[PDB]
Enzyme design. Structure first.
Site, PDB file in Angstrom:
ATOM      1  N   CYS A 177       0.791  -1.236   0.000  1.00  0.00           N
ATOM      2  CA  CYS A 177       0.000   0.000   0.000  1.00  0.00           C
ATOM      3  C   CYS A 177       0.824   1.288   0.000  1.00  0.00           C
ATOM      4  O   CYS A 177       0.313   2.360  -0.336  1.00  0.00           O
ATOM      5  CB  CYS A 177      -0.958  -0.011   1.200  1.00  0.00           C
ATOM      6  SG  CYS A 177      -2.143   1.343   1.333  1.00  0.00           S
ATOM      7  N   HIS A 212      -4.417  -4.031   1.656  1.00  0.00           N
ATOM      8  CA  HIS A 212      -3.752  -4.571   2.824  1.00  0.00           C
ATOM      9  C   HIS A 212      -4.061  -6.052   2.913  1.00  0.00           C
ATOM     10  O   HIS A 212      -5.200  -6.413   3.239  1.00  0.00           O
ATOM     11  CB  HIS A 212      -4.219  -3.854   4.081  1.00  0.00           C
ATOM     12  CG  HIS A 212      -3.716  -2.454   4.202  1.00  0.00           C
ATOM     13  ND1 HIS A 212      -4.422  -1.367   3.740  1.00  0.00           N
ATOM     14  CD2 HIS A 212      -2.573  -1.963   4.732  1.00  0.00           C
ATOM     15  CE1 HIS A 212      -3.737  -0.265   3.988  1.00  0.00           C
ATOM     16  NE2 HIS A 212      -2.610  -0.599   4.585  1.00  0.00           N
ATOM     17  N   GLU A 230      -3.168  -8.062   5.147  1.00  0.00           N
ATOM     18  CA  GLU A 230      -3.060  -8.527   6.525  1.00  0.00           C
ATOM     19  C   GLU A 230      -4.398  -8.971   7.087  1.00  0.00           C
ATOM     20  O   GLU A 230      -4.508 -10.059   7.660  1.00  0.00           O
ATOM     21  CB  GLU A 230      -2.496  -7.427   7.412  1.00  0.00           C
ATOM     22  CG  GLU A 230      -1.068  -7.044   7.169  1.00  0.00           C
ATOM     23  CD  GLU A 230      -0.918  -5.932   6.183  1.00  0.00           C
ATOM     24  OE1 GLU A 230      -1.952  -5.419   5.728  1.00  0.00           O
ATOM     25  OE2 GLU A 230       0.231  -5.552   5.876  1.00  0.00           O
TER      26      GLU A 230
END
Ligand SMILES: Nc1ccn([C@@H]2O[C@H](COP(=O)(O)OP(=O)(O)OP(=O)(O)O)[C@@H](O)[C@H]2O)c(=O)n1
Ligand SMILES: Nc1ccn([C@@H]2O[C@H](COP(=O)(O)OP(=O)(O)OP(=O)(O)O)[C@@H](O)[C@H]2O)c(=O)n1
Ligand SMILES: Nc1ccn([C@@H]2O[C@H](COP(=O)(O)OP(=O)(O)OP(=O)(O)O)[C@@H](O)[C@H]2O)c(=O)n1
Ligand SMILES: Nc1ncnc2c1ncn2[C@@H]1O[C@H](COP(=O)(O)OP(=O)(O)O)[C@@H](O)[C@H]1O
Ligand SMILES: Nc1ncnc2c1ncn2[C@@H]1O[C@H](COP(=O)(O)OP(=O)(O)O)[C@@H](O)[C@H]1O
Ligand SMILES: Nc1ncnc2c1ncn2[C@@H]1O[C@H](COP(=O)(O)OP(=O)(O)O)[C@@H](O)[C@H]1O
EC number: 6.3.4.2
Lengths: 557, 557, 557
Positions: free
Chosen positions: B399, B526, B528
């Site tokens: 990002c 993202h 994650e």
């Protein structure tokens, strides 16, 4: 008189008594005269009905008190000799007021816990602060007060109300306040939190006291932003949040508080006449705390006892012993042997508990037999005293050990094997240790020999007269009931063991010294409680001067 | 709906969130459907205005939330996807009620904190419990509620009053209560105390809740006489004082509570339809907690970042990364490199901070560049991406790393050295990374690209299409403002770096894959927050499959 | 600046506001300059969205505040003119901090209720104490602070924490503390107890404040052994337990506190520059409290209103009215008539509610029509204004009464019966009362005419220019939206009713005076809030000078 009230914070086992006594050692060594009134939340009037295992180690005063373990901590960190009313327990006020309401000393009036208990606490602490607790007869100057137990518990409620009103009996400039608190932290996070210090002081202000010092106790020394946080939530400047981390010794606790600048705080808070110089005698406490960590030699002496572990139960003895070991430069390895484990019972049923305890007795280069009451664990210690006589290890018997050594000497050098005590199988074939209680005019019945009595030497070649300083008489604390029988002096006229100690009127023998052995002595008194960390107890010094070979060269200067 | 309210006890950093989520993992793996409503005492409505350094790690939901770090702990220990109103902060109620008192939705009536705040909390938790937080559209069955912050603090006072009245809105058999407490101990004493657990529950009963479980957290597991003591002072049977000691992992916390038999307790307390069998899927959490301690191999990848330390600030990334490392059997040594320390500034003024951080970058066999906003710490990470391209180490950009890699590729393989972003020296000579905010009909101005959007692949030989499972489209969480300029695709037509990812309407490029290098990929989203400990995030798996050589053999089955 | 914080004790309806304002009247009349910051636990930012029935009586300031009833009590007991931020409510801080956390004025940092709310209260009270609340531009000298609501409630918790830390922002000698407490008693026993005063101060000390005064409020004056009891449990000398019994008036409350010697206490507590003389202007408050009980004459005027009872809802009006009646020596019998009960609806369905309310209107010698919003209760008051015109009773219309009198004059002397307002059946056949909101440059849309505006007279033979003192312009508080239509001045050119009042730019007419009637006047402004107990509001004086015949002789001197 100035008053310092320590009080607990979050949990119980913080260390009030090492904080409260170290405030004593500062102001003892600033020139001021200090007393100590430890409050106790428990109920035991004339407290020594305990089991030493539980609780721990009934302490003995001069007048004959049966007083808490933690009052002994004041009589070492100061040279104070405390009195039996200089302790105060919950069941000492409630007995004092019930005795006054039945005489009618309140004139009816419906006695209450406020004020008629809180007055009785305040009349108590206004009086026992005044009594000169040092040997120097002079009214004292401060009074450290240790309120035992935590706060917010329901024994603080009679006492923190009693000290709530006591802020205003004295002036503002006569009553400080210490609040010792827990500042926990978790391992992998490192955050040193101080929520419970906030909620304890909020509980304390609701009880009516505000902390003047807030002594936070942690593992690591607390960060300078942590004491900035307690300053906003507990109403004190950040210079007054004293830390005390995981100390390596109790002797560092007085010199640690001084570097936190508490001496400068009590100069303005209580207006005490300290002065401004080297702020204490740093040359005593730091000068031995440097010696306590600089110890690499070993005088590993044994201590056979009635109890399973050192949940403390011999704190006093332990303490005297180190006090000697600090003066000999030896790290004392106290091997604690249980007396039951050395018996003939144990080797039959459980050899591992047997041999592991004996193995400690074989490696040891000193046997200490302390006091104790009862038949339990007696026959094991009779094997250990025979291990001191037949293998030549330095020995010291204290108040039962003096009794049991004289018993086993008759069994093993005189072959009077049927001789025993009258505590043990009381209908005695040969009554060598009999009962002889005292008769002081003023009580009824057989009182215990209890308190400071006089002990007179008999001979000149005494290894204790060498140690006490060639004096004719000594004064030590007694606590027992029994004596060696005066009608068995006939069987003791010429052989190895003889008597050296004796009281005034001569009916009772005190101190023995065996010949052809470097150290085999036994005392009726308790040598422990007269010891300090400055002067060792002289029987305990001779037990460690003989446990390292220096007993020869000590008696050539 | 059944309700479980955890609430803190003595101090702050106990571990509510690992207790509250592990109650979720049990009842997730008992067959029941679970939600999670974390209460927060702080004031930040739409919370992600923080600095990740402070606080830590702004978390992103599907709808576009800017939500607390600790709500990410629920979206991993469960496969839940939370909503932005499924968090609740103090400044979210007070904004919700101020907006209702100005419309006039109370009809005057002098709105108050009781009841008009405590109703607004109860209307909130009656609603967000009902919303299906799993992807399966079905009304849920329990609701774990995490009241953040301690108790007796003055943010619990609006909320513990709100859950005081909420015991009786629901029935007695719909509302349990967990109270997680600190049970400290001191080192050399061993006594495991539990005074503050008593005084916290007394504070809790005065607030109007009684604990049904009391989860005591210590260092060692608490003794069976300690939980007998809490049973008398906190009004619960001794089978309900659950311990949690110093766990070696967070994955052991769910299997540790099960052996404390909490599943049998919530069967009778809440009357839940569990059943009686192997009480959970023990075959998932214990079957990886055995794998987490059985880790002796190392995949020590680097993570250059804007921040000085891992006061957490990348918890999410860290977590995704292990999730991969658990599936590769490698103990991940996360070397955290500060981006400022690799700059040309640092080597001039301070070489020790310079070389020690570079030395970590040289030994590392993976560079991860996570997200971040601003010019600060940017020029250091541009050196690290050049260290991935010129020395062939596996790389992943997230990002900002996708943005900075495309910038430095133009500087070092196309020699468009004047090309930069428009965040950085905004009057751009060559505008390669420009601003392009979204325009969704319903708001005004330039909105952030935020939430679940669709990402469409372009080619077939994608190393991410190999990893996601040959699917045409993926859905991942976005949080940024900027894009690569579509008028610089002309300069990218034929060389090594090309574009693979693309959104729906095609204006914005997403995913890059550099040729003639085993792993150099960069993403706008993202990766994650879509990871679990069951399924790794597929970009993070390829960053560790290439960091140990298994990226070849993984793509042959 | 010196600070006085009153705070409540046992229950709610004690009388903080009469205690807090009477501390103002003392130090106003000692020469010092006083402000007033009333804290409020409720949430209503810009509070006047209430229903006056609930709550009661939205008060109007100079700048345009919509402020609490109890802030009007400061603008009468002092000549203070308060500002809209000189009130402070719970939902005014929480809106002030939510607006600052979204701008980013905290730089992330995770805003909290401690300190980021308690700072916002302390920044507020450090600022609004400084603003000159008198017309004399000079920084003030003390600041009475009224913390509304009791203590131990969960709105005190944000504020008593905010004043806990505020003891130490200021010095000890800048921040006093008042704690007003309930001292109940039972009837047939006579014991005047004071347990809850003890348990409130214990709750107060746990919150972090200690009372400097403890103002006990009872029925009978408390015994001298009762204040001796509070001295021991609340940490203050017995001269500082001020009693306040069942006062016969609010004007006796300032002279009652002076005889309790509070002036001597604040001289040493706050080190204020009072002096030592006749301790206040006793010649004003006692000199009217003697006049208030010496009232045997009656000026029983009526007050038709929209509401069922005087749960206060017209406190302001009531108060202005007495203020006149104190200057005329008449005990005012306020007959409160409900406007619904005079309608044509009531006589059909319920004649007892009808005739009993009319009977009050017939005996009355003054009709007052105060302000109000809506169609409800309008058609009843139109009958009452016709009862003032056709039977010659003194009349005063306030802000709706001025509107409704001009409406009914067209219906009954001009026979424009179809003329109405535009609030009422808005599609108007003959638009006599239309909407005309303001347009001040700086806002958007139609703002209410609100605050101090200028009102210019037109003629010379005005019965209000006779009363205000022949001045060209007056300044009074406005709160409305509507006006009389300027295109209906054509129908008003020559007949009995004419216009006297007018604003600056002339579009809006203010004050009417009907001819051939001793008193028929109507005002757009609210005359209430500029009244004091020294100077009456001049429209309210003329309504009572005409209600007793003295309107002739008053205008001959
Ligand atoms: N005495 C206090 C302390 C904190 N808070 C509130 O609780 C939050 C923080 O809680 P906690 O972490 O328990 O307080 P800390 O002081 O940070 O904890 P510690 O003592 O571990 O530093 C803050 O936002 C504050 O608004 C409170 O109401 N009362
Ligand atoms: N909730 C309690 C606990 C104890 N006490 C009193 O305080 C003494 C013990 O205090 P403390 O050691 O603080 O209690 P423990 O429970 O022993 O401490 P811990 O929690 O560490 O076990 C007891 O004699 C008891 O009378 C009390 O009033 N209220
Ligand atoms: N137990 C309570 C009661 C009230 N409040 C707050 O205090 C305000 C009202 O205070 P008070 O008048 O003391 O409560 P009442 O119940 O109205 O008083 P009473 O008992 O006389 O009815 C409410 O806005 C509420 O938010 C509170 O925090 N806790
Ligand atoms: N002044 C002192 N001298 C010697 N030993 C001490 C002293 N104060 C405390 N100790 C010992 O150290 C230990 C510390 O615990 P302690 O302070 O008694 O806990 P608490 O705060 O609950 O009284 C005690 O067991 C006590 O035996
Ligand atoms: N369910 C979870 N999954 C992953 N990480 C967690 C979970 N719960 C807690 N953590 C992490 O472990 C740490 C434990 O502290 P935490 O439980 O947040 O303290 P508190 O009780 O004050 O919330 C936190 O910093 C958090 O980042
Ligand atoms: N300074 C004042 N001037 C005029 N009226 C007042 C004053 N103070 C209080 N009052 C009135 O007298 C009543 C007394 O109650 P109050 O003091 O408001 O209770 P509380 O202590 O809950 O605020 C109130 O209803 C208020 O309208």
């Amino acid at each position: 008189m100035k008053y310092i009230l320590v009080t607990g914070g979050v949990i119980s086992g913080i260390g009030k008594g090492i904080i409260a006594s170290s405030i004593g050692t500062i102001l003892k060594s600033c020139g001021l005269r200090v007393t100590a009134i430890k409050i106790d939340p428990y109920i035991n009037i004339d407290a020594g009905t305990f089991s030493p295992y539980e609780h721990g180690e009934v302490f003995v005063l001069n007048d004959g008190g049966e007083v808490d373990l933690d009052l002994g901590n004041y009589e070492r960190f100061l040279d104070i000799n405390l009195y039996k009313d200089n302790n105060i327990t919950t069941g000492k006020i409630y007995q004092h007021v019930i005795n006054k309401e039945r005489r009618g000393d309140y004139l009816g009036k419906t006695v209450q816990v406020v004020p008629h208990i809180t007055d009785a606490v305040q009349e108590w602490v206004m009086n026992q602060a005044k009594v000169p607790v040092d040997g120097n007869k002079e009214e004292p100057q401060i009074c450290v007060i240790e309120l035992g137990g935590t706060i917010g518990d329901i024994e603080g409620m009679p006492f923190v109300e009693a000290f709530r009103q006591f802020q205003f009996k004295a002036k503002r400039e006569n009553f400080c306040n210490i609040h010792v608190s827990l500042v926990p932290q978790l391992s992998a996070t490192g955050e040193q939190k101080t929520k419970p210090t906030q909620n304890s002081v909020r509980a304390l202000r609701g009880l009516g006291l505000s902390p003047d010092l807030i002594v936070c106790r942690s593992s690591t020394p607390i960060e300078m932003a942590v004491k900035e946080k307690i300053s906003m939530f507990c109403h004190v400047n950040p210079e007054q949040v004293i830390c005390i981390h995981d100390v390596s010794s109790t002797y560092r606790v007085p010199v640690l508080l001084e570097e936190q600048s508490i001496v400068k705080y009590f100069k303005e808070r209580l207006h005490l006449p300290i002065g401004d110089s080297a702020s204490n005698l740093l040359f005593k406490w730091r000068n031995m705390a440097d010696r306590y960590e600089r110890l690499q030699k070993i005088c590993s002496i044994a201590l056979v006892g009635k109890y399973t572990k050192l949940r403390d139960c011999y704190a006093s003895v332990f303490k005297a012993l180190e006090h000697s070991a600090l003066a000999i430069n030896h790290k004392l390895n106290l091997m604690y042997i249980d007396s039951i484990d050395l018996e003939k019972i144990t080797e039959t049923e459980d050899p591992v508990k047997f041999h592991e305890a004996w193995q400690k007795l074989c490696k040891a280069d000193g046997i200490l037999v302390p006091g104790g009451f009862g038949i339990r664990g007696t026959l094991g210690k009779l094997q250990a005293i025979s291990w001191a006589r037949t293998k030549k290890i330095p020995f010291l018997g204290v108040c039962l050990g003096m009794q049991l050594a004289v018993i086993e000497f008759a069994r093993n050098c005189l072959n009077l094997k049927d001789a025993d005590s009258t505590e043990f199988r009381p209908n005695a074939p040969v009554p060598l240790v009999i009962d002889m209680p005292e008769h002081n005019p003023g009580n009824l019945g057989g009182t215990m020999r209890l308190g400071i009595r006089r002990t007179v030497f008999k001979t000149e070649n005494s290894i204790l007269r060498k140690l006490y300083g060639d004096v004719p008489f000594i004064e030590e604390r007694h606590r027992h009931r029994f004596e060696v029988n005066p009608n068995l002096i006939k069987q003791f006229e010429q052989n190895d063991l003889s008597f050296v100690g004796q009281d005034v009127d001569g009916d009772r023998m005190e101190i023995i010294e065996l010949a052809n052995h470097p150290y085999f002595v036994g005392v009726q008194f308790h040598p422990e409680f007269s010891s300090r960390p400055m002067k060792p107890s002289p029987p305990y010094l001779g037990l460690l001067l003989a446990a390292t070979g220096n007993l020869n060269a000590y008696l050539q200067q």
